Amino acid sequence: ATCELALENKSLPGTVHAYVTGHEQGTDRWVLLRPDGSVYRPDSPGAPQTPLPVDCAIPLKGAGAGPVVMTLPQMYGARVYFVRDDKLDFYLNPGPSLVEPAFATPTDPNYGRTWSFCEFTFNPQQLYANISYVDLVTALPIGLTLEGDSTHTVAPLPDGAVQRIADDLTAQAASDGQPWDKLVTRGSDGQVLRVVSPQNLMAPFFDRPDQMPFRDLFTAQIDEVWEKYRSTDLRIDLQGGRGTLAGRVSGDTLTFEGGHTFVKPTSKDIFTCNHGPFANDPADSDDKKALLARIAAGFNRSIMLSHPQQPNGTTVADYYKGGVTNHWSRVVHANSPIGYAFPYDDVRPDGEPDVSGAAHDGNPRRFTVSVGS
């Protein structure tokens, strides 16, 4: 099966190029869709940082001129990139390993460029696409529509969201002295290009935690939470009808019935949702993983003190209250109609709507990916 990929610039003046990158189903080989509709499968280069030998920039028709429509082959771990004005510099490392523009790396050739991407996978089961703000929001917000068995739309960041987000986070930084303002990337001309989530600002300092931004953002709150649940249960509803597991902090180990253990998180853990007690471990049981997700989510949303039982019984109104919270997620949620802003944002109270930025269809006919509005 293949699917139509429609690439659209709705409204933005100037030049927009799309890139489509992914792994070809089966071969696992990096592929790029080419402007001519064909696939470019890079060979492994003779040297690292080898510029992409083929220009895979797909020029979009002008604002409102309609979509570039190509045949999307099946591929996984795929991305649709957009870039304004410039093209993106993709490179090849031996492998071939596609060197993807690193939005949170200031040395990156594209760091000063206005670009964005969304993610998708297209296999014989489905096309699954995702607008996610876990890592960044950009001046080039992407929206998508997946037409197949049904029509699925994911609304983009509204025009100007990245500026609002940058401004809110800078305002936050003024208020709390935390480096929320450092999450903002401005081009050499002051244009807000993107704002990245805190883990992306923290990741360069993972090797040097003492200098890590936000290192102690959550430290006091975590101690408060850990202390709270030394003397009263934390009840985590695994949901899906699996029930709640009650946990108590034993020393520094949050331990649930069933033997699930969570060492005291750090601010790093809370932001990445993937270190300390939130480190993904494939050996983890489903329950452990469900517990992990919900605990990380509750820390990010700062409901660990307010809600000894969660996520059921909590609402979005409970999230992100007080000075110490994942303000990135709070601000992105305030400035986005849909889509997750942190890795366990999919944790939601039963009966609350899916606010993922995902669209998926088992019989995709057209995947329309658009910038502008």
Side-chain angles (χ1 to χ4, degrees), residues 3-23 26-27 29-56:
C3 169
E4 278 181 354
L5 173 62
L7 300 166
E8 198 174 21
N9 173 13
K10 290 180 179 302
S11 65
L12 301 178
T15 292
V16 179
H17 286 98
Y19 298 78
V20 187
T21 70
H23 304 256
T27 82
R29 284 275 300 286
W30 275 113
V31 288
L32 285 95
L33 271 189
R34 294 180 62 203
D36 67 356
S38 74
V39 178
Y40 170 51
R41 193 175 316 108
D43 294 312
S44 179
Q49 206 58 204
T50 293
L52 205 65
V54 178
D55 192 334
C56 297

Coordinates of all heavy atoms in Angstrom, one line a residue, residues 3-56, unseen atoms left out:
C3 N 0.3 5.8 -0.2 CA -0.6 6.9 0.3 C -0.2 8.2 -0.3 O 1.0 8.3 -0.6 CB -0.6 6.9 1.9 SG -1.4 8.3 2.6
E4 N -1.1 9.1 -0.5 CA -0.8 10.4 -1.0 C -0.2 11.2 0.1 O -0.8 11.2 1.2 CB -2.0 11.1 -1.6 CG -2.2 10.7 -3.1 CD -3.4 11.4 -3.7 OE1 -4.1 12.1 -2.9 OE2 -3.7 11.2 -4.9
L5 N 0.9 11.9 -0.1 CA 1.4 12.9 0.8 C 1.2 14.3 0.2 O 1.7 14.5 -0.9 CB 2.9 12.7 1.1 CG 3.6 13.8 1.9 CD1 2.9 13.9 3.3 CD2 5.0 13.5 2.0
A6 N 0.3 15.1 0.8 CA 0.0 16.4 0.3 C 0.8 17.4 1.3 O 0.6 17.3 2.5 CB -1.5 16.7 0.3
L7 N 1.6 18.2 0.7 CA 2.4 19.2 1.4 C 1.9 20.5 1.0 O 1.9 20.9 -0.2 CB 3.9 19.0 1.1 CG 4.4 17.6 1.5 CD1 5.8 17.3 0.9 CD2 4.5 17.5 3.0
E8 N 1.5 21.3 2.0 CA 0.8 22.6 1.7 C 1.4 23.7 2.6 O 1.7 23.5 3.8 CB -0.7 22.4 2.0 CG -1.6 23.5 1.4 CD -3.1 23.2 1.6 OE1 -3.4 22.4 2.6
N9 N 1.5 24.8 1.9 CA 1.8 26.1 2.7 C 0.5 26.9 2.5 O 0.1 27.2 1.4 CB 3.0 26.8 2.1 CG 3.1 28.2 2.7 OD1 2.5 28.5 3.7 ND2 4.0 29.0 2.2
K10 N -0.2 27.1 3.6 CA -1.5 27.7 3.5 C -1.4 29.2 3.4 O -2.4 29.9 2.9 CB -2.3 27.4 4.8 CG -2.8 25.9 4.8 CD -3.6 25.7 6.1 CE -4.1 24.2 6.2 NZ -4.9 23.9 5.0
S11 N -0.3 29.9 3.8 CA -0.4 31.3 4.1 C 0.9 31.9 4.2 O 1.0 33.2 4.4 CB -1.3 31.5 5.3 OG -0.6 31.0 6.4
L12 N 2.0 31.2 4.3 CA 3.2 31.8 4.6 C 3.9 32.4 3.4 O 4.0 31.7 2.4 CB 4.2 30.9 5.3 CG 3.6 30.3 6.6 CD1 4.6 29.4 7.2 CD2 3.3 31.4 7.6
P13 N 4.3 33.7 3.4 CA 5.0 34.2 2.2 C 6.4 33.6 2.1 O 7.0 33.1 3.1 CB 5.0 35.7 2.5 CG 5.1 35.8 4.0 CD 4.3 34.6 4.5
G14 N 7.0 33.7 1.0 CA 8.3 33.3 0.8 C 8.4 31.8 0.5 O 7.4 31.1 0.1
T15 N 9.6 31.2 0.7 CA 9.8 29.9 0.2 C 9.7 28.9 1.4 O 10.2 29.2 2.5 CB 11.2 29.8 -0.4 OG1 11.3 30.5 -1.6 CG2 11.6 28.4 -0.7
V16 N 9.0 27.8 1.1 CA 8.9 26.7 2.1 C 9.3 25.5 1.3 O 8.7 25.1 0.3 CB 7.5 26.6 2.6 CG1 7.4 25.4 3.6 CG2 7.1 27.9 3.3
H17 N 10.2 24.8 1.9 CA 10.6 23.4 1.4 C 10.2 22.4 2.5 O 10.3 22.7 3.7 CB 12.1 23.3 1.2 CG 12.5 24.0 -0.1 ND1 13.1 25.3 0.0 CD2 12.5 23.6 -1.4 CE1 13.3 25.6 -1.3 NE2 13.0 24.7 -2.1
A18 N 9.7 21.3 2.0 CA 9.5 20.1 2.9 C 10.6 19.1 2.7 O 11.1 19.0 1.6 CB 8.1 19.5 2.7
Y19 N 10.9 18.4 3.7 CA 11.7 17.1 3.6 C 10.8 16.0 4.2 O 10.1 16.2 5.2 CB 13.0 17.2 4.3 CG 13.9 18.3 3.8 CD1 13.7 19.6 4.2 CD2 15.0 18.0 3.0 CE1 14.5 20.6 3.7 CE2 15.8 18.9 2.5 CZ 15.6 20.2 2.9 OH 16.4 21.2 2.4
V20 N 10.9 14.9 3.6 CA 10.3 13.7 4.1 C 11.4 12.7 4.3 O 12.1 12.2 3.4 CB 9.2 13.1 3.2 CG1 8.5 12.0 3.9 CG2 8.3 14.2 2.8
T21 N 11.7 12.3 5.6 CA 12.7 11.4 5.9 C 12.0 10.2 6.7 O 11.0 10.4 7.3 CB 13.8 12.0 6.8 OG1 13.3 12.3 8.1 CG2 14.3 13.2 6.1
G22 N 12.6 9.0 6.6 CA 12.2 7.9 7.4 C 13.0 6.7 7.1 O 14.0 6.8 6.4
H23 N 12.5 5.6 7.6 CA 13.2 4.3 7.4 C 12.3 3.4 6.5 O 11.1 3.3 6.9 CB 13.5 3.6 8.7 CG 14.4 4.4 9.6 ND1 15.7 4.2 9.8 CD2 14.0 5.5 10.3 CE1 16.2 5.1 10.6 NE2 15.2 5.9 11.0
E24 N 12.8 2.9 5.4 CA 12.0 2.1 4.6 C 11.6 0.8 5.3 O 12.4 0.2 5.9 CB 12.7 1.8 3.3 CG 11.8 1.0 2.3 OE1 13.1 2.1 -0.1 OE2 14.7 0.5 1.4
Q25 N 10.3 0.5 5.2 CA 9.8 -0.7 5.8 C 10.6 -2.0 5.4 O 10.7 -2.2 4.2 CB 8.3 -0.9 5.6
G26 N 11.1 -2.7 6.3 CA 11.9 -3.9 6.0 C 13.4 -3.7 6.0 O 14.1 -4.2 6.8
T27 N 13.8 -2.9 5.0 CA 15.3 -2.7 4.8 C 15.8 -1.9 6.0 O 17.1 -1.9 6.2 CB 15.5 -2.0 3.5 OG1 15.3 -0.6 3.6 CG2 14.6 -2.6 2.4
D28 N 15.0 -1.2 6.8 CA 15.4 -0.3 7.8 C 16.3 0.9 7.3 O 16.8 1.7 8.1 CB 16.1 -1.0 9.0
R29 N 16.4 1.0 6.0 CA 17.3 2.0 5.4 C 16.7 3.4 5.4 O 15.5 3.5 5.0 CB 17.8 1.6 4.0 CG 18.8 0.4 4.1 CD 20.2 1.0 4.3 NE 20.6 1.9 3.2 CZ 21.0 1.5 1.9 NH1 20.9 0.2 1.6 NH2 21.3 2.4 1.0
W30 N 17.5 4.3 5.9 CA 17.1 5.7 5.7 C 16.6 6.0 4.3 O 17.3 5.6 3.3 CB 18.3 6.6 6.0 CG 18.4 6.9 7.5 CD1 19.4 6.5 8.3 CD2 17.5 7.7 8.3 NE1 19.2 7.0 9.6 CE2 18.1 7.8 9.6 CE3 16.3 8.4 8.0 CZ2 17.4 8.5 10.6 CZ3 15.7 9.1 9.0 CH2 16.3 9.1 10.3
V31 N 15.5 6.6 4.2 CA 15.0 7.1 2.9 C 14.6 8.5 3.0 O 14.2 9.0 4.1 CB 13.9 6.2 2.3 CG1 14.4 4.9 1.8 CG2 12.7 6.1 3.3
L32 N 14.6 9.3 1.9 CA 14.1 10.6 1.8 C 13.3 10.7 0.6 O 13.6 10.1 -0.5 CB 15.2 11.7 1.7 CG 16.0 11.9 3.0 CD1 17.2 11.1 3.1 CD2 16.3 13.4 3.2
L33 N 12.1 11.3 0.7 CA 11.3 11.5 -0.5 C 11.9 12.7 -1.2 O 12.5 13.6 -0.6 CB 9.9 11.9 -0.1 CG 8.9 10.7 0.0 CD1 7.5 11.2 0.2 CD2 9.0 9.8 -1.2
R34 N 11.9 12.6 -2.5 CA 12.6 13.6 -3.3 C 11.5 14.5 -4.0 O 10.4 14.1 -4.2 CB 13.4 13.0 -4.4 CG 14.6 12.2 -3.9 CD 15.4 11.6 -5.0 NE 16.0 12.7 -5.9 CZ 16.3 12.5 -7.1 NH1 16.2 11.3 -7.7 NH2 16.8 13.5 -7.8
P35 N 11.9 15.8 -4.3 CA 10.9 16.6 -5.0 C 10.3 16.0 -6.2 O 9.2 16.3 -6.5 CB 11.8 17.9 -5.4 CG 13.2 17.5 -5.0 CD 13.1 16.5 -4.0
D36 N 11.1 15.2 -7.0 CA 10.5 14.5 -8.1 C 9.6 13.4 -7.8 O 9.1 12.7 -8.7 CB 11.6 14.1 -9.1 CG 12.5 12.9 -8.5 OD1 12.3 12.5 -7.4 OD2 13.4 12.4 -9.3
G37 N 9.3 13.1 -6.5 CA 8.4 12.0 -6.2 C 9.1 10.7 -5.9 O 8.4 9.8 -5.3
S38 N 10.3 10.6 -6.3 CA 11.0 9.3 -6.1 C 11.6 9.3 -4.7 O 11.7 10.3 -4.0 CB 12.1 9.1 -7.2 OG 13.2 10.0 -6.9
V39 N 12.1 8.1 -4.3 CA 12.8 8.0 -3.0 C 14.3 8.1 -3.2 O 14.8 7.5 -4.2 CB 12.4 6.6 -2.4 CG1 13.2 6.4 -1.1 CG2 10.9 6.6 -2.2
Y40 N 15.0 8.7 -2.3 CA 16.4 8.7 -2.3 C 16.8 7.9 -1.1 O 16.5 8.2 0.1 CB 17.0 10.1 -2.1 CG 18.4 10.1 -1.8 CD1 19.3 9.3 -2.6 CD2 18.9 10.8 -0.7 CE1 20.6 9.3 -2.3 CE2 20.3 10.8 -0.5 CZ 21.1 10.0 -1.2 OH 22.4 10.0 -0.9
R41 N 17.5 6.8 -1.3 CA 18.0 5.9 -0.3 C 19.5 6.1 -0.2 O 20.2 5.6 -1.0 CB 17.7 4.4 -0.6 CG 17.9 3.4 0.5 CD 17.4 2.1 0.1 NE 16.1 2.1 -0.6 CZ 15.9 2.0 -1.9 NH2 14.7 2.1 -2.5
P42 N 20.0 6.9 0.8 CA 21.4 7.2 0.8 C 22.2 6.0 1.0 O 21.9 5.1 1.8 CB 21.5 8.2 2.0 CG 20.2 8.4 2.5 CD 19.2 7.5 1.9
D43 N 23.4 5.9 0.3 CA 24.3 4.9 0.7 C 25.1 5.5 1.9 O 25.2 6.7 2.2 CB 25.3 4.6 -0.4 CG 24.5 3.9 -1.6 OD1 23.8 3.0 -1.3 OD2 24.7 4.3 -2.7
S44 N 25.8 4.5 2.6 CA 26.7 5.0 3.7 C 27.8 5.8 3.1 O 28.3 5.5 2.0 CB 27.3 3.8 4.4 OG 28.2 4.2 5.4
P45 N 28.1 7.0 3.7 CA 29.1 7.9 3.1 C 30.5 7.4 3.6 O 30.7 6.7 4.5 CB 28.7 9.2 3.8 CG 28.2 8.8 5.1 CD 27.4 7.5 4.9
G46 N 31.5 7.9 2.8 CA 32.8 7.6 3.1 C 33.4 8.4 4.3 O 34.5 8.1 4.8
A47 N 32.6 9.4 4.8 CA 33.1 10.2 5.9 C 31.9 10.7 6.7 O 30.8 10.7 6.2 CB 33.9 11.4 5.4
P48 N 32.1 11.0 8.0 CA 31.0 11.6 8.8 C 30.7 13.0 8.3 O 31.4 13.6 7.5 CB 31.5 11.6 10.2 CG 33.0 11.7 10.0 CD 33.3 10.9 8.8
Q49 N 29.5 13.5 8.7 CA 29.1 14.8 8.3 C 29.1 15.0 6.8 O 29.5 16.1 6.3 CB 29.9 15.8 9.1 CG 29.3 17.2 9.3 CD 27.9 17.1 10.1 OE1 27.1 18.0 10.0 NE2 27.8 16.0 10.9
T50 N 28.8 14.0 6.1 CA 28.8 14.1 4.6 C 27.5 14.8 4.2 O 26.4 14.3 4.5 CB 28.9 12.8 3.9 OG1 30.2 12.2 4.2 CG2 28.7 12.9 2.4
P51 N 27.6 16.0 3.5 CA 26.3 16.6 3.1 C 25.5 15.6 2.2 O 26.0 14.8 1.5 CB 26.8 17.8 2.2 CG 28.2 18.0 2.7 CD 28.8 16.7 3.1
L52 N 24.2 15.7 2.4 CA 23.3 14.8 1.7 C 23.6 15.0 0.2 O 23.4 16.1 -0.4 CB 21.8 15.2 2.0 CG 20.9 14.1 1.8 CD1 21.2 12.9 2.7 CD2 19.4 14.5 1.9
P53 N 23.9 13.9 -0.5 CA 24.4 14.1 -1.9 C 23.3 14.5 -2.9 O 23.5 14.9 -4.0 CB 24.8 12.6 -2.3 CG 24.9 11.9 -1.0 CD 24.0 12.5 -0.1
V54 N 22.0 14.3 -2.5 CA 20.9 14.7 -3.3 C 20.1 15.7 -2.6 O 19.9 15.7 -1.4 CB 20.0 13.4 -3.6 CG1 18.8 13.8 -4.4 CG2 20.8 12.4 -4.3
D55 N 19.6 16.8 -3.3 CA 18.8 17.8 -2.7 C 17.4 17.2 -2.6 O 16.7 17.0 -3.6 CB 18.8 19.0 -3.6 CG 18.1 20.2 -2.8 OD1 17.3 19.9 -1.9 OD2 18.5 21.4 -3.1
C56 N 17.0 16.8 -1.4 CA 15.7 16.2 -1.1 C 14.7 17.3 -0.6 O 13.6 16.9 -0.2 CB 15.9 15.1 -0.1 SG 16.9 13.8 -0.8

